[PDB]
Amino acid sequence: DNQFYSVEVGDSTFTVLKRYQNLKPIGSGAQGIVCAAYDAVLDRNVAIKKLSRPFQNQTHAKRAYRELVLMKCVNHKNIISLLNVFTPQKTLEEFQDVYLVMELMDANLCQVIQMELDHERMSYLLYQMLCGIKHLHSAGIIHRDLKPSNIVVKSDCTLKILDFGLASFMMTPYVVTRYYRAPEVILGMGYKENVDIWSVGCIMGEMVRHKILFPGRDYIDQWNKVIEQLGTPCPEFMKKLQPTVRNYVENRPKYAGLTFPKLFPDSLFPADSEHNKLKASQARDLLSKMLVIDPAKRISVDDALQHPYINVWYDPAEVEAPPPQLDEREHTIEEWKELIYKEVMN
């Protein structure tokens, strides 16, 4: 007779609508735990995400509220869509957890990066990532924190981006992945649309090399990896850093930078035919236009899509889409709880 039922997925209690059956663990993100389930009404498999007390702190609250708001309006194949939103709690006072439902995907882009993919799959995943980013940009949303763990894929190579980016202190054991963040973000230096192009390049290079391009304990070790490989940036770029950050970066040892065939040799690409020899040079040309420290000289999202390696997948209804109280910040626990509760029940 009750509309919900309780099941223990590992060590996380999922209390869901009775339509959701056969829950199975499939991932453990920094925001919440996710399950696979069969939906009895839609007759299809779905993913369920639980947000445990999203209102418990500013970082948790601004992301939980912001994503619920942005999902209600963005409409694209390469951006996550919500099939459902629900809370087992009946009142604001008892309100604790929120559950988000989406189509069940088959794998995380982290899993896909470990595979030796051909040029056709590699170029189709990169194409979709750019279409998703271009739609977010079209809707006034520059991401700034795109990474493989918040990107999911189907067996038919279709791709969807799960989060919406940046808005500080998290008092937990799990630490955030900063390896795909642009130099503009690392150095706390103003941004524009192509900041996400850098993150696409970090993914593309890792797809080729099968290792994180810019590893590091903190942004100190990270900036070391960006200049050792790509070189110390030109004086034009140093002439737009903040004074304090400028003296750090200009004081760092200078590097000429390894050329893109040295960083990504012919060995790492399929080269068994003329078609593959050409596609290796086209992929290496794009990596060299995406992994550019200066955003003024880094490639556009529109130009990235029109590049020969990517423009083989172009279609009119898979690039642009008709665009449409723009978010809130700084609230108590109770004020954030109420704002999030409002979005959950319209």
Ligand X SMILES: O=C(Nc1cnn(-c2csc(C(=O)NC3COC3)c2)c1)Nc1c(F)cccc1Cl
Binding residues for ATP: 26-34, 49
Whose Cβ is closer to ligand X: residue 104's or residue 202's? Answer: 104
Secondary structure of residue 7 in the 3-state scheme: strand
Asked if 84 and 329 touch (Cβ cutoff 8 Å), the reply is no
In the annotated binding site, the residues are: 26-34, 49
Token digits of residue 175: 């630490």
Whose Cβ is closer to ligand X: residue 80's or residue 310's? Answer: 80
> Is 145 marked active-site?
yes
- Min dist. Cβ of residue 108 to ligand X (A): 5
**Residues interacting with ligand X, by CB under 6 A?**
26-27, 34, 36, 47-49, 80, 100, 102, 104-108, 152, 162
Using CA atoms, how far apart are residues 44 and 103, in angstroms rounded to an integer? 8
Asked if 210 and 114 touch (Cβ cutoff 8 Å), the reply is yes
DSSP 178-195: -TT--HHHHTT----TTH
Using CA atoms, how far apart are residues 89 and 215, in angstroms rounded to an integer? 42
**Strand order of the sheet with strand 151-153?**
107-108, 151-153, 159-161
Whose Cβ is closer to ligand X: residue 45's or residue 222's? Answer: 45
- Min dist. Cβ of residue 107 to ligand X (A): 5
User: 22 phi and psi, to 5 degrees?
Assistant: 55, 65
**Strand order of the sheet with strand 44-52?**
20-28, 33-39, 44-52, 97-103, 84-86
Whose Cβ is closer to ligand X: residue 98's or residue 293's? Answer: 98
- Min dist. Cβ of residue 103 to ligand X (A): 7
Radius of gyration of the chain (CA): 22
- Choose the catalytic residue: 97, 145, 163, 196: 145
Q: What is the largest CA-CA distance in the chain?
A: 70
Residues catalogued as catalytic = 145
